Amino acid sequence: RDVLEVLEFPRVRALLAERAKTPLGRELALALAPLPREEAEKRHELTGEALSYPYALPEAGTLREAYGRALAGARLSGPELLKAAKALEEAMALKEELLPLKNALSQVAEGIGDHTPFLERVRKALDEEGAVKDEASPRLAQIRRELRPLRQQILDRLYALMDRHDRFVTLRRERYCVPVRAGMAQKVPGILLDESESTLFIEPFSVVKLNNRLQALRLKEEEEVNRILRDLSERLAKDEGVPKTLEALGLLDLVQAQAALARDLGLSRPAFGERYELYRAFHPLIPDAVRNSFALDEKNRILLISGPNMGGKTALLKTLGLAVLMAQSGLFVAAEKALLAWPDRVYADIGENLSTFAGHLRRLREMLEEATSHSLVLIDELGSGTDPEEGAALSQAILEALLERGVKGMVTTHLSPLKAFAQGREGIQNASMRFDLEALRPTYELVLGVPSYALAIARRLALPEEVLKRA
Amino acid sequence: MRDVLEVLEFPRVRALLAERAKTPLGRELALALAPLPREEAEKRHELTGEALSYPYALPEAGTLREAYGRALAGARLSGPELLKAAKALEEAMALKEELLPLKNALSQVAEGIGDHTPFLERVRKALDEEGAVKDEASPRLAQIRRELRPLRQQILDRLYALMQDRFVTLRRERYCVPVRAGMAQKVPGILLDESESGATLFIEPFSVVKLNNRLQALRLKEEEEVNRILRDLSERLAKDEGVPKTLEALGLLDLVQAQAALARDLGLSRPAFGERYELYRAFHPLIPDAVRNSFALDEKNRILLISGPNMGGKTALLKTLGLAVLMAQSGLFVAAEKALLAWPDRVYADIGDENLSTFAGHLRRLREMLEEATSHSLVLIDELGSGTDPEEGAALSQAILEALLERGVKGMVTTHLSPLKAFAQGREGIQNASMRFDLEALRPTYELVLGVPGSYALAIARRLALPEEVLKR
Ligand SMILES: [Mg+2]
Numbered sequence: 001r002d003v004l005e006v007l008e009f010p011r012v013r014a015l016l017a018e019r020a021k022t023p024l025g026r027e028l029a030l031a032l033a034p035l036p037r038e039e040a041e042k043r044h045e046l047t048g049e050a051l052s053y054p055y056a057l058p059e060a061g062t063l064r065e066a067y068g069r070a071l072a073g074a075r076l077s078g079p080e081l082l083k084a085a086k087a088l089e090e091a092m093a094l095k096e097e098l099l100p101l102k103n104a105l106s107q108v109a110e111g112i113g114d115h116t117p118f119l120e121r122v123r124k125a126l127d128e129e130g131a132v133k134d135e136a137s138p139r140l141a142q143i144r145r146e147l148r149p150l151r152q153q154i155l156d157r158l159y160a161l162m163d164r165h166d167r168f169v170t171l172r173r174e175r176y177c178v179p180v181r182a183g184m185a186q187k188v189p190g191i192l193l194d195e196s197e198s199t200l201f202i203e204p205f206s207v208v209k210l211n212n213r214l215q216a217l218r219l220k221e222e223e224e225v226n227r228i229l230r231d232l233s234e235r236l237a238k239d240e241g242v243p244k245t246l247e248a249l250g251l252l253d254l255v256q257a258q259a260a261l262a263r264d265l266g267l268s269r270p271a272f273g274e275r276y277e278l279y280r281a282f283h284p285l286i287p288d289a290v291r292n293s294f295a296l297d298e299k300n301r302i303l304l305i306s307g308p309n310m311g312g313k314t315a316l317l318k319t320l321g322l323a324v325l326m327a328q329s330g331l332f333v334a335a336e337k338a339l340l341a342w343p344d345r346v347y348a349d350i351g352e353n354l355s356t357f358a359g360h361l362r363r364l365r366e367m368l369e370e371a372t373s374h375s376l377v378l379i380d381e382l383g384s385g386t387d388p389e390e391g392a393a394l395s396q397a398i399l400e401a402l403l404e405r406g407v408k409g410m411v412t413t414h415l416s417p418l419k420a421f422a423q424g425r426e427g428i429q430n431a432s433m434r435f436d437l438e439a440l441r442p443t444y445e446l447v448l449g450v451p452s453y454a455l456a457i458a459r460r461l462a463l464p465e466e467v468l469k470r471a
Numbered sequence: 472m473r474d475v476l477e478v479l480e481f482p483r484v485r486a487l488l489a490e491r492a493k494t495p496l497g498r499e500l501a502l503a504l505a506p507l508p509r510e511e512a513e514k515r516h517e518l519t520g521e522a523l524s525y526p527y528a529l530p531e532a533g534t535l536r537e538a539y540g541r542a543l544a545g546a547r548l549s550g551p552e553l554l555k556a557a558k559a560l561e562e563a564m565a566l567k568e569e570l571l572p573l574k575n576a577l578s579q580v581a582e583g584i585g586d587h588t589p590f591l592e593r594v595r596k597a598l599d600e601e602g603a604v605k606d607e608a609s610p611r612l613a614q615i616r617r618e619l620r621p622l623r624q625q626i627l628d629r630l631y632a633l634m635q636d637r638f639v640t641l642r643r644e645r646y647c648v649p650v651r652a653g654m655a656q657k658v659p660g661i662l663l664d665e666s667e668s669g670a671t672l673f674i675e676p677f678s679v680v681k682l683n684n685r686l687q688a689l690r691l692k693e694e695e696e697v698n699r700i701l702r703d704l705s706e707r708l709a710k711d712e713g714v715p716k717t718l719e720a721l722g723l724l725d726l727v728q729a730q731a732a733l734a735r736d737l738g739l740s741r742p743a744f745g746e747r748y749e750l751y752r753a754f755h756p757l758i759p760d761a762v763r764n765s766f767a768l769d770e771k772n773r774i775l776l777i778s779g780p781n782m783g784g785k786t787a788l789l790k791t792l793g794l795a796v797l798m799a800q801s802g803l804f805v806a807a808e809k810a811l812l813a814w815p816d817r818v819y820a821d822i823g824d825e826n827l828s829t830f831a832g833h834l835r836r837l838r839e840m841l842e843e844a845t846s847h848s849l850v851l852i853d854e855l856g857s858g859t860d861p862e863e864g865a866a867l868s869q870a871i872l873e874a875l876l877e878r879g880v881k882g883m884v885t886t887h888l889s890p891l892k893a894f895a896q897g898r899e900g901i902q903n904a905s906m907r908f909d910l911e912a913l914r915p916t917y918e919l920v921l922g923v924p925g926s927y928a929l930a931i932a933r934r935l936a937l938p939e940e941v942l943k944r
Pocket residue numbers: 614615
């Protein structure tokens with residue numbers, strides 16, 4: 001179970017994937033993972049530029065679905081082509097919007113292609129709703145040029161209808177015919193196409209030749225139109241700039257979504273350095289999360305939050321681990337100011353009995369063996385769940401082996417000997433969480449240096465004073 | 472501050488008991504089951520033992536009850552519904568005669584089953600095994616039936632001769648004949664109810680109208696006289712004054728049966744009540760494959776302290792004892808092989824489901840023990856002193872334990888705080904215990920170790936192959 005799942009990283013993915021406008025944005029968000037450092041700094045620069053300069057996005061997913069269908073040999077039965085062409089037209093308009101900015105957004109937009117040869121071919125063929133126009137091919141215009149007067153002349157020749165005794169021309173099997181009355185059917189010699197039983201659609205002999213011509217022309221129309229549409233489909237397949245444009249569109253969707261996550265969750269851009277320093281940091285997934293400030297550097301490598309148990313100790317562990325993980329993946333981080341180191345590997349021992357203590361020792365054991373001076377360790381509930389005497393003896397040895405490593409991070413425990421160990425030791429400082437006695441609730445507030453409550457609480461709950469004299 | 476039966480998952484035991492009831496009546500008693508007066512509880516114990524000794528069937532009382540309540544409301548009951556309620560009473564009297572010679576607590580209950588012979592002898596005369604009213608139920612109905620049978624047979628209507636569709640049919644319970652359309656003459660009688668498309672006409676000829684008029688007036692006279700008999704039998708059930716007492720007796724016998732079914736299926740045994748607690752091979756009935764343990768509390772050793780880091784079953788023991796007391800006080804058998812139990816005035820459960828908020832929550836329950844509990848009380852405390860300073864919490868926890876030892880309360884306490892197991896040695900009335908741990912499998916066993924102070928910490932680290940240069944520098 002990787003540290004991403006322990007620190008609830010995939011919930012940050014799902015919040016990010018809420019704000020993606022396109023499926024391409026969602027796929028990047030839902031696969032998001034920590035990055036090499038100077039790529040992740042580019043995402044931070046992109047996120048800051050997106051906050052300054054918002055932009056719209058085309059329908060990249062519908063473009064990609066049409067683009068995939070065209071590559072597969074399907075006649076991309078347009079429009080669909082017009083929707084795909086309109087996405088490319090908006091993509092190019094998006095590109096020329098971002099280029100003058102002369103920044104990281106403009107560099108991403110440089111991968112948006114020149115799709116004018118596809119656009120001009122489409123717009124000369126079909127531009128208004130995806131009806132294939134007459135002039136899309138010279139053959140089709142000639143075929144249309146006989147379709148209109150032949151179709152009108154059939155309707156002109158069907159009065160006829162106006163000699164006789166239910167007074168509308170209709171199509172059956174895409175041939176023109178007339179609804180005679182069943183008794184009067186001898187007045188209109190023709191061919192029976194349909195009856196309703198409730199009558200007698202008859203195609204008169206005089207329009208049989210015209211309908212035979214009209215049917216024959218419509219076959220030649222449809223054969224040419226599909227030949228045009230298949231040609232347009234293979235243009236979209238053979239446009240080599242589409243995948244690079246789609247990659248740019250997907251990345252710009254992710255960056256804008258990252259900006260929205262920073263806007264909504266109150267995130268700020270981290271800066272990277274040789275040490276940890278966070279000012280008013282919080283856990284972004286906790287509503288009304290309370291801000292705490294702390295630092296880790298080479299002089300003080302490990303922070304030991306020696307409590308009575310929690311009221312926010314485990315949350316502060318998950319706060320620091322998320323901030324480093326979200327910074328390394330190019331997101332902003334949940335603080336007002338954050339200076340962060342770059343750990344090679346983040347170790348989190350986070351989950352209270354003897355066999356939960358055994359689970360803690362496994363992740364500590366990997367922590368002992370393989371963590372380096374560049375690593376970041378998050379250790380929860382250290383020494384709890386076992387014998388408090390040998391548990392403190394084991395925990396102190398593990399801590400000073402990690403101090404001997406040079407590793408950085410935070411450790412929480414409630415074992416009394418360890419709080420005196422940290423005060424009498426280099427490289428580790430004590431901390432605690434302030435508890436509100438008047439309300440009997442934790443304040444979730446870090447107190448930097450003061451490591452108690454028990455009789456004080458028993459007073460406030462008004463236990464008998466005879467009990468609370470022998471104490 | 473909610474009830475201690477909720478904490479011990481007692482309503483689960485209610486649901487399991489109601490699953491084994493035969494009737495809604497015994498289901499209703501199961502779901503309202505509460506700790507009882509002690510004389511009532513021992514009667515339930517002796518009932519449950521005798522129901523184990525002699526299994527018995529139950530009627531469906533509950534079809535009886537709902538039919539009886541409708542008869543009180545003045546509705547006319549159906550034929551088969553009256554028969555079904557009669558069969559409930561008939562089997563109830565058979566159950567009474569079955570149980571009475573036993574001359575025990577079951578027979579004392581079964582006296583409340585009434586004598587329903589006058590209602591039954593009305594019923595068996597009136598209507599058959601299927602709920603149809605016989606001819607002889609009233610002389611009027613016999614006369615009406617004696618005119619129905621020949622008249623209904625006499626409708627031929629074999630008028631063919633002519634022709635159709637081969638079959639005589641009924642429309643509005645009037646016999647009619649399916650002449651094919653276009654032969655509406657020759658077979659006149661164009662009085663009809665219509666039909667679809669060609670097959671049609673369903674004619675009554677102008678011969679059988681007269682003896683469809685009669686045989687329809689007769690069916691009206693039949694319906695009224697049948698319904699009068701049905702209503703009269705419905706009211707006689709309502710006027711039967713022994714039905715509510717019989718339903719009361721049957722419903723208790725359903726509850727006693729389910730308790731016997733509960734004790735068979737959960738491996739429960741009849742508790743004995745006395746001045747002290749002694750459990751042999753006790754287990755939590757809601758835990759599958761539950762682990763047996765034995766423990767005893769008396770006035771010499773009031774409080775058993777289970778001191779140890781473990782999960783084990785430290786809490787499940789607290790539930791095991793407390794649920795056993797509450798089931799015993801409810802007239803249920805308890806989850807042990809042998810169980811001597813005292814009768815506490817109150818049971819106090821300090822159980823959660825650990826840190827400053829929950830430590831304050833424990834003290835708010837522990838306040839009630841320090842205020843209200845008497846020397847007869849049973850106290851169950853979980854996680855004593857945990858979630859706070861190991862120094863100052865132990866001093867507070869030892870102070871509370873000293874107060875409870877002066878009070879004379881009996882019960883069971885869990886902690887992991889080291890001074891307390893040093894305290895339990897050399898103090899009267901409190902005794903150490905602990906949970907065994909399986910080092911080689913890294914599981915709690917689950918079982919309790921009496922008397923040995925409770926770890927394992929460095930053994931776990933050596934088991935898990937932590938580096939030896941780490942271990943105690
Ligand atoms: Mg009569």
